[PDB]
Amino acid sequence: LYSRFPLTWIMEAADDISYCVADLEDAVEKRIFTVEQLYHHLHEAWFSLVVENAWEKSRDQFFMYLRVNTLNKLVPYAAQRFIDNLPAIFAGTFNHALLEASECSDLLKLYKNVAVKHVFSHPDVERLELQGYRVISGLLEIYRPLLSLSLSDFTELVEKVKRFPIESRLFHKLSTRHRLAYVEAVSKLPSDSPEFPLWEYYYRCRLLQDYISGMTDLYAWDEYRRLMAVEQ
Amino acid sequence: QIDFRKKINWHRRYRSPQGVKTEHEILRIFESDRGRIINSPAIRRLQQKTQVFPLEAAVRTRLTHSMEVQQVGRYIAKEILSRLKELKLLEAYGLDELTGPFESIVEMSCLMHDIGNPPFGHFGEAAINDWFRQRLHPEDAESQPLTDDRCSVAALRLRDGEEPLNELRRKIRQDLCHFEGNAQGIRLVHTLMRMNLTWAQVGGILKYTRPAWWRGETPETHHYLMKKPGYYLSEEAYIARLRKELNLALYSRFPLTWIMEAADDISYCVADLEDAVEKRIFTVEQLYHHLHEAWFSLVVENAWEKSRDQFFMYLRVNTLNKLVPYAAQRFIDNLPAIFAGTFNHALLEASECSDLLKLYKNVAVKHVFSHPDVERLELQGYRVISGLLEIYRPLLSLSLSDFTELVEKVKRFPIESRLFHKLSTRHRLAYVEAVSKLPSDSPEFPLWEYYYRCRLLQDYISGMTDLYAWDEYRRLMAVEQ
Amino acid sequence: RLYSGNLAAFKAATNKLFQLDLAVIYDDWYDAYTRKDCIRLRIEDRSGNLIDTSTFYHHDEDVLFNMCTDWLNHMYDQLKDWK
């Protein structure tokens, strides 16, 4: 109970390295600031080996040199951490991460804080973040009427209605796979226990969340404007 | 005694030029003041605000209208100076070496008339006032504490059993629902932009004298000078010193302001009419027919008969030659009262001038302001301002500690932090300086902090253009990318 | 044009009078003989009987609305002692 599969640790480690460096590069490509500002901010927020080699051997090809050194400094550390604590990982009870006081933590924190200071504070990211929040809230509000029905009404609506035009159209707007998943999940339930409505409501909410989470950014945005009669 | 040397003050609030000076140094000071005023971002913002018709053709903006008001004010000032020089009263009134400053101050006051209006004008102010009236309900604080207080703020409720703190809540609640363009213009010139103008230049843009927190009836000897709010509660101290610098009593007015007001009354009519023709609404023949039906002989007959782009250039000139000398004579005749600051009338307020101005105004109201496009723009602007205020509402629901922590740097308020970062730098700096000076121990701190937070919101909302506010409103509503 | 705050104050006074079980009748026009605008207010009750009626003349509407609101508040104070 509450244990973890060994190889997962390795995957987690990877998600922690790339997470920093890639973002930084894109900041230059969108014409936000430049290489000189990169070094100035890094030096102010601060190491000798990677940073000095990257800054001095450089005087599209700067990042191709910066990655390699970071990988050759980080990967063997993760390999040795995996091998050293192997019995605990194989048991599944290792309560730490591979890269979690060495210089690796300091370098990763340097990259992360530079990215937070100079990239994530740009107005465009902030605006996109607010717009996405509002779009998701609006879509949930639009699909709310499906959750206000009753057990008999929703059951009848699933099997085929003339009494629920708006609700029937909203339901038909959902995907086939999610509705089939709902049907299979609800069919197996005992139809006599006093716990049937609870499970049915749970699976209805699950169906709504699957539909909402199965979209892309552009599709959800366009569908939100279409359902609000803002665009044809 | 009339002595214009006691009214034209060239001192400043910061780094003031002290000592004795000659005519040339004074003229250079006022030229420098012109240099600061003309090259300001407020004028370039005036460049893109609508006057009557939506911004497309060659219709007029705020700036071109200000350019007519400036010309009229300068011409009236020159006529006044010439008439005073003819009667050999120029040297006895202290104006012998102050004509240039006179004309410059009048022109610059005429240029800064529209600096503080919000986007969409009259319909922007209405929206702000109604929103804050719904939030605060100032009519429930006029008397002893009630049990049915409809205020939505815990700290602004009138909780019976304390009379020293109540007076302050009443003042703040009444002030926050009286946004007005001229008070915001004074606040912008002094606090937000920090232009450091001379005392006379700042006094030239004080049009009305009623405080924004006023409750009740005004004295019968000031009922015209106090028909609109004049300044906010955050500028009171400032205004006090201004009076000490210009020898003005309570609820009094600076002389030259009268001239500026007069100008704003002439152009106001004629310009609008011309634009109606340029947008292809009706024509010259209809103009004369409507004027004749709504009605004089001299101007109208000369304009209509000598005409049979060049019709209006002839119509203006006659109106100016009929109106400007009347204003000059009205200024000179009632000079002691104006110099005292207690003249309870306007210069152009039963002569034929009033009839001609009313003719132009009623024709414009009948045939121009009733067009569907103006009406539609007016409704759209109201809705946009209300929507923006609703969007920024969550910033006003926080607490003192939360907002203070948010100002100093958060992880607990993502949406609120992004909304706060969306505001401009100058407004946030003004808030910081205003709040820093407050005593951090008095029980009056939350009241003042809420007042300054609402002031920050109103400055941000009023510091936009029509197009910027419209675009930002659609962006924040996820209607456009 | 008329300032928004003055209209808001006049509306608040009208609502206060109406909540007092009274009726406010508003009429307005322009007098070219005196070259001004005139506003007459006629106060009534639930039955529809005149109580107080007054007319004001002025050339600027901002002062006119202020005078009307002042008169309405004065009557409200007068007749709100009781009834």
Added chain:
Amino acid sequence: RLYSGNLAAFKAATNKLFQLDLAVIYDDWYDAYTRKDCIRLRIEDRSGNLIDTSTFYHHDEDVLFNMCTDWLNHMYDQLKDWK
């Protein structure tokens, strides 16, 4: 970054403490000597007197917020017997 549910639970605990006529003071910073982040919480009352104050150190914020919420619930259970 911090997960939304943990922040929601912390906010719920803070609201529960505040409804109990108590005050919660939050401060935070980073300690480079220990290479971690530190959060101090100071509980108070309507008068403004300190009652319980504790500081937590950790390198991951998700665990830090969970510890803080657990401590807040523990004090709420302690001081909600009465008063």
